[PDB]
Design an enzyme around this catalytic site. Structure first.
Site, mmCIF file in Angstrom:
data_model
loop_
_atom_site.group_PDB
_atom_site.id
_atom_site.type_symbol
_atom_site.label_atom_id
_atom_site.label_comp_id
_atom_site.label_asym_id
_atom_site.label_seq_id
_atom_site.Cartn_x
_atom_site.Cartn_y
_atom_site.Cartn_z
ATOM 1 N N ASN A 261 0.745 -1.233 -0.014
ATOM 2 C CA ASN A 261 -0.007 0.025 -0.144
ATOM 3 C C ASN A 261 0.699 1.152 -0.101
ATOM 4 O O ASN A 261 0.286 2.235 -0.408
ATOM 5 C CB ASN A 261 -0.926 0.003 1.187
ATOM 6 C CG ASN A 261 -0.462 0.163 2.456
ATOM 7 O OD1 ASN A 261 0.728 -0.333 2.716
ATOM 8 N ND2 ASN A 261 -0.966 0.760 3.393
ATOM 9 N N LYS B 195 12.311 -7.715 2.395
ATOM 10 C CA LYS B 195 11.178 -8.694 1.783
ATOM 11 C C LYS B 195 10.092 -7.825 1.305
ATOM 12 O O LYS B 195 9.413 -7.616 2.299
ATOM 13 C CB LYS B 195 11.192 -9.836 2.315
ATOM 14 C CG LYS B 195 10.220 -10.949 1.661
ATOM 15 C CD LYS B 195 8.918 -10.640 1.470
ATOM 16 C CE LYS B 195 8.434 -12.144 0.722
ATOM 17 N NZ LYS B 195 7.056 -11.554 0.164
ATOM 18 N N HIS B 196 9.993 -7.312 0.046
ATOM 19 C CA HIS B 196 8.661 -6.639 -0.064
ATOM 20 C C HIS B 196 7.612 -7.348 -0.818
ATOM 21 O O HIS B 196 7.833 -8.527 -0.878
ATOM 22 C CB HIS B 196 9.186 -5.664 -1.181
ATOM 23 C CG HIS B 196 8.513 -4.236 -0.997
ATOM 24 N ND1 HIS B 196 7.289 -3.929 -0.601
ATOM 25 C CD2 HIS B 196 9.155 -2.969 -0.997
ATOM 26 C CE1 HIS B 196 7.071 -2.651 -0.329
ATOM 27 N NE2 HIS B 196 8.141 -2.234 -0.680
ATOM 28 N N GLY C 144 2.204 -5.517 7.745
ATOM 29 C CA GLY C 144 1.370 -6.340 6.645
ATOM 30 C C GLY C 144 0.107 -6.987 7.472
ATOM 31 O O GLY C 144 -0.397 -6.280 8.383
ATOM 32 N N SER C 145 -0.355 -8.175 7.067
ATOM 33 C CA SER C 145 -1.536 -8.787 7.425
ATOM 34 C C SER C 145 -1.414 -9.563 8.811
ATOM 35 O O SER C 145 -0.165 -9.566 9.156
ATOM 36 C CB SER C 145 -1.999 -9.758 6.555
ATOM 37 O OG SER C 145 -1.130 -10.812 6.220
ATOM 38 N N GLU D 139 3.626 -4.100 12.664
ATOM 39 C CA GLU D 139 2.532 -3.019 12.236
ATOM 40 C C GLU D 139 1.658 -3.667 11.417
ATOM 41 O O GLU D 139 1.675 -4.022 10.212
ATOM 42 C CB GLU D 139 3.148 -2.054 11.372
ATOM 43 C CG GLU D 139 4.301 -1.066 12.217
ATOM 44 C CD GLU D 139 3.638 -0.084 12.990
ATOM 45 O OE1 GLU D 139 4.423 0.527 13.903
ATOM 46 O OE2 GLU D 139 2.451 0.276 12.770
ATOM 47 N N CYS E 79 -3.890 1.338 6.363
ATOM 48 C CA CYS E 79 -4.323 0.699 7.624
ATOM 49 C C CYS E 79 -4.868 1.612 8.530
ATOM 50 O O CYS E 79 -5.981 1.516 9.205
ATOM 51 C CB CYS E 79 -2.945 0.292 8.102
ATOM 52 S SG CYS E 79 -2.251 -1.124 7.376
ATOM 53 N N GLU F 284 -11.917 -5.660 8.822
ATOM 54 C CA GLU F 284 -11.209 -4.398 8.432
ATOM 55 C C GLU F 284 -11.571 -4.677 6.858
ATOM 56 O O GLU F 284 -11.172 -5.630 6.542
ATOM 57 C CB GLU F 284 -9.583 -4.346 8.741
ATOM 58 C CG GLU F 284 -9.060 -3.566 7.515
ATOM 59 C CD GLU F 284 -7.400 -3.587 7.895
ATOM 60 O OE1 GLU F 284 -6.888 -4.593 8.363
ATOM 61 O OE2 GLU F 284 -6.917 -2.548 7.603
#
Lengths: 455, 455
Positions: B131, B154-155, B206-207, B228, B262, B359
């Site tokens: 995002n 690590k994207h 991330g998730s 996060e 987020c 969410e």
């Protein structure tokens, strides 16, 4: 498996019953409600008074709590009294620093006004070891109690009387039931507690085995943690070390609590020129050990906390010798019902020796010989641990310079380890992460709540 | 597979090759050696200069890096330019606060001289989301680079071009190879990296699923972490809220980055008195959306980052309705190759409706009606998330008092979410733990090395 088995006589004094699933469930709901209660109303001033009260009782019945620790894990009564004194201090410390540590922190920005609140997050799980029954609890209970985080404690199975009695201590101080509850639970129940949504974080002091285990369960449930694991501290003696002063700290440095201290001076790093001299001094010091009844005022060497511990320290010495280590002193088995292990000194340690990288939680001095500071620093950093350590040099500017070059969490100058309320305690590598005590320890489970107001 | 598939056309523009095992091995050893170099000798000034240079280049080639993100995950080109501006900022902030932040901390104690050093700890693994391709990376890279912790990234698999170009950016600025390396690795490899003794910590964004998995592996290996995760922020409109301002911020609050934030204002909490008034306003605002080519200045609503993303949101909207929710606006399918989802508004959500607690990472406004301010605080807290949130009120002290009662990490007064390098970012509950940015995020993987000299 929670029993108080006096280390001196090896006789079971008290056996405690485990907690049931329902009991645990009730404890968590009580704790969770208390958290919410402290979140809605401002009961801060009360907890401060209650914390001071805890200190007073400890002071008042110091000898009572001291003996409980001695009979539980067999440490010198005089040391136990000392632990209690540190506890009275950690308690008064946070009760006094309460208002300062909790006030809002303003932030600087041009975009407007901002600051952050120090709020409570919920129920905290504390997992502690037997080496310092009361200190290990107070170290994390005092801060969180002030913050407003109810606590649940899972202590070691060999010091149940101390764990149980600490809960009563807090209750006797006027603290609301649930402020801290002791849990005689198994490790399966520990994972359940961690998986419970009412628990927000875990702070564990102990072994790597348990640390990895708990940390993993903690991470699987997105819970924050702090690990205070073991140490293999390096006591470095530089060329300008004061030897009259050095002689005064040696005994304490490695024989305090029979060597059962995470920040014990496990590794002695000495220069080629001082090698022989040090072997003589450490030997002279280890010879003054008077082992025996830990309740007796004239005993200076207690027995290890459990028959397993003794078995482990001995197996470790054996293993060292089987791989090349040189036996400098001790190694003689003691004849007595108690879990005693006589002070032992080994040197001639090399990298191909497994003990070179292992932590011996007993009265075993280890001498490493180097030819310079460069080498000293190298041996010191050649470890999976990084908790404490000592630098001995009459030139403090010099000691400081060297200390900063050590990969560790703490460095003590011209002295053994020391713990104080104001001083942060924790390490790196396999010694864990996160800091306890001081203000850094106060915020471990605090919610920095940012309030931002743009223009 | 790491591929760049333009969300607008759904065409494959780039296909990168995954990193080999040996390549991974070489990268970590290079990072480890670089960490040692920065730990053994001071190169802070060099890093400061290079970070400032990273900002210079970004400033210079803003449009080039902006188009990269737009083509990677499809966001509006103008929003991407904004992202780059925030990166330039973060970079300069940390380069400017370097000396100040890395300054040793004195400790008050009447028993001796004490202070602690802020030192580097090792190689940090960073797992960042799509995002905010650049912002996400810069948030952790800037502070850690200054600190001295080399980094491996690590994207997301859908934005490999961004990930790769950022590394190139850092090398262009002159930073030594190893400062940050992009890893096109699998999740099995991420696990290997986490198990490597050379990596000392993990900061993930991330998730929940990914976080649990990553935190679990980090815990099993004693590695510190900061998470996060997502959010479901409550936007509370008090009784004294100013509707002129309210109208001005609404589009941004939920439709910025097409709702894939987020800290998006996912849960609007209004009073009966304003319920119907708000439904009109939010509808009026949502109707102004103009979806289309993200590169086009006209466009005010971008397509989602991927097909799966759209499928997911569409399912959530459907799920909410099948469980009682009411469709206030939109919900119609956009006929176009891109992953478009037209702005949608739903209301009448009840605790028995799953979406009430889920969410939604899409352009979906959600309206919750409450009868009092207290009920508002209750609904706001009746969440498994606790990242950000907004309190809308013309009375500052009132808004600040309400904010304090919300169980969340950040509160924005009279505005949508914001993010400045001086402001700490992070939340509680299922939103994770730890903070990023400001001085707090700086010391996340720092070693507080206590130096203690008793009297």
């Amino acid at each position: 498996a929670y029993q108080t088995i006096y280390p001196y006589t090896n006789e079971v004094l008290h056996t405690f019953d485990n907690m049931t699933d329902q009991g645990l469930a009730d404890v968590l709901e009580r704790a969770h409600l208390l958290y919410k209660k402290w979140r809605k109303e401002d009961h801060l001033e009360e907890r401060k008074a209650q914390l001071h009260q805890v200190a007073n009782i400890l002071r008042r019945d110091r000898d009572k709590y001291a003996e409980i620790m001695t009979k539980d894990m067999g440490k010198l009564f005089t040391e136990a009294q000392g632990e209690v004194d540190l506890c009275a201090d950690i308690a008064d410390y946070y009760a006094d620093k309460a208002d300062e540590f909790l006030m809002s922190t303003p932030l600087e920005t041009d975009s407007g006004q901002a600051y952050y609140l120090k709020q409570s997050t919920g129920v905290i799980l504390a997992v502690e070891p037997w080496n310092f029954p009361y200190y290990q609890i107070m170290r994390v209970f005092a801060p969180n109690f002030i913050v407003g985080n109810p606590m649940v404690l899972k202590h070691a199975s060999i010091c149940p009387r101390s764990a149980q009695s600490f809960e009563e201590l807090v209750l006797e101080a006027g603290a609301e039931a649930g402020s801290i509850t002791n849990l005689f639970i198994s490790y399966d129940q520990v994972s359940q507690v961690i998986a419970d949504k009412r628990v927000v974080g875990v702070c564990l002091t102990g072994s790597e085995r348990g640390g990895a285990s708990i940390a993993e369960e903690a991470g699987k449930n997105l819970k924050k943690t702090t690990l205070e694991l073991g140490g293999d501290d390096a006591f470095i003696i530089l060329d300008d070390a004061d030897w009259d002063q050095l002689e005064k700290v040696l005994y304490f440095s490695r024989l305090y609590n029979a060597g059962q201290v995470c920040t014990s001076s496990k590794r002695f790093i000495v220069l080629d020129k001082d090698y022989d001299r040090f072997k003589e001094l450490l030997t002279k010091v280890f010879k003054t050990a008077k082992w025996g009844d830990p309740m007796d005022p004239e005993t200076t060497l207690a027995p290890l906390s459990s028959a397993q511990a003794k078995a482990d320290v001995l197996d470790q010495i054996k293993l060292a010798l089987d791989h090349g280590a040189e036996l400098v002193y001790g190694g003689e088995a003691i004849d007595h019902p108690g879990h005693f292990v006589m002070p032992t000194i080994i040197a001639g340690l090399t990298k191909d020796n497994p003990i070179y990288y292992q932590e011996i939680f007993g009265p075993v001095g280890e001498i490493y010989k180097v030819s310079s500071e460069e080498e000293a620093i190298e041996v010191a950093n050649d470890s999976n641990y990084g908790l404490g350590g000592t630098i001995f040099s009459s030139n403090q500017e010099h000691a400081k310079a060297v200390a900063a070059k050590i990969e560790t969490g703490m460095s003590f100058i011209n002295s053994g380890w020391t713990s104080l309320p104001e001083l942060p305690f924790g390490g790196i590598k396999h010694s864990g992460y996160g800091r306890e005590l001081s203000e850094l320890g106060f915020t471990s489970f605090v919610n920095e709540h940012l309030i931002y107001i743009p223009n």
